[PDB]
Amino acid sequence: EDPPACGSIVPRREWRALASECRERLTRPVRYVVVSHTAGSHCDTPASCAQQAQNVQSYHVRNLGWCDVGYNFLIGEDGLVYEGRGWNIKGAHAGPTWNPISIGISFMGNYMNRVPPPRALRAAQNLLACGVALGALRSNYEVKGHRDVQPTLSPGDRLYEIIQTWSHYRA
């Protein structure tokens, strides 16, 4: 009944992110979403999770010399979504084939034998619904596991098993 009806996200400033230097854009509406895990520690409070995002970005920018954290969005077990390169800027999370044509969302943690809490699964599912609402994603977008498109255990066996049941999943 009025337009902007979709998910809250922790803004970069809020998680105290280094300025992005990335400028290559995606073309909306984007067709694919690749779900990964950071494979590191998880966080379960808004406090722990903002720090984690700064840590993930630090690894990609400081160590890897990347223009910004590689993921478009990050999911906290705080139940919050952390803004990464966002809906419009090409990410660096799934290789040269998938990066220019997808949105990379990464769950912050390691989900090989642990599942993300429901507030995390809700957070991610709402963000995607929001992306469709916004025209950032196609209504018939496809979700892929990181391991479906790159050689990796990402997004973790437990999380991978869950995304496979999602409405938009397509291997």
Ligand X SMILES: OC[C@H]1O[C@H](O[C@H]2[C@H](O)[C@@H](O)[C@@H](O)O[C@@H]2CO)[C@H](O)[C@@H](O)[C@@H]1O
Ligand Y SMILES: CC(=O)N[C@@H]1[C@@H](O)[C@H](O)[C@@H](CO)O[C@H]1O
Residues engaged in binding a copy of itself (CB under 8 A): 1-11, 14, 21, 23, 27, 31, 38-39, 44-47, 59-60, 63-65, 67, 70, 78-80, 93, 95-98, 100-101, 117-119, 121-123, 125-126, 129, 132-133, 135, 138-140, 148-153, 166-167
CB atoms within 10 A of CB 66: 17
**11 contacts ligand Y (rule: CB under 6 A):** no
- Give 10's strand partners: 82
The backbone region for 79, taken as left when phi is positive above 0, alpha when psi lies in -120 to 50, beta otherwise, is left
Our CB check for ligand Y shows the closer of 46 and 100 to be 100
Smallest CA-to-CA distance from 32 within 136, 126, 109 is with: 136
* 66 belongs to the binding site for ligand Y (CB under 6 A): yes
Under the binding rule (CB under 6 A), the answer on residue 66 touching ligand X is yes
Burial class of 72 by CB neighbour count within 10 A (0 to 12, 13 to 18, 19+): buried
| List of residues contacting ligand Y (CB under 6 A) | 66, 90, 92, 95-97, 99-100, 140
